[PDB]
């Protein structure tokens, strides 16, 4: 029953309330899933993606931590190589 893009949308908003606008969080989720479903992952395109959004963001201790939780959440996600394990991982973060 879990579908990937709205699940990620919900988790990111729970990690980082109000950090991104609705429109930008959706664009971010779409770019994340595009990288996640790419055939072969090269280097670490994920961190550069996140760094790009972080340039547009606020310096404050709250938002710094929000971005750290996002990048650790996504780093582990991009380590998961099969779908049932991914569902399990996401279902854990759905408690937040």
Residue numbers in the entry: 0 to 95
Sentences from the paper on this structure:
Microtubule (MT) filaments, composed of α/β-tubulin dimers, are fundamental to cellular architecture, function and organismal development. They are nucleated from MT organizing centers by the evolutionarily conserved γ-tubulin ring complex (γTuRC). Here we used cryo-electron tomography to determine the structure of the native γTuRC capping the minus end of a MT in the context of enriched budding yeast spindles.
We determined a crystal structure of the Spc98NHD at 1.9 Å resolution, revealing a compact α-helical bundle nearly identical to the AlphaFold2 prediction. Interestingly, S. cerevisiae Spc98NHD is more compact than the extended GCP3NHD/GCP6NHD folds alone and thus more similar in size and fold to half of the composite Mzt1-GCP3NHD/GCP6NHD structures. This observation could explain the absence of Mzt1 in budding yeast as Spc98NHD is more compact and its structure by itself makes up for the lack of Mzt1. The γTuRC luminal bridge density can in principle accommodate a trimer of the Spc98NHD crystal structure, in agreement with an AlphaFold2 prediction of a trimeric Spc98NHD oligomer (head-to-tail). It is likely that the other four Spc98NHD domains are not bound in the γTuRC lumen, and are averaged out due to the flexible linker between Spc98GRIP1 and Spc98NHD, similar to γTuRC in higher eukaryotes. Consistent with our model, deletion of Spc98NHD in S. cerevisiae impaired cell growth under stress and reduced γTuRC oligomerization propensity in vitro. In budding yeast, however, there is no Mzt1 homolog, nor nuclear actin, and we propose that the luminal density corresponds to an oligomer of the compact Spc98NHD helical bundle.
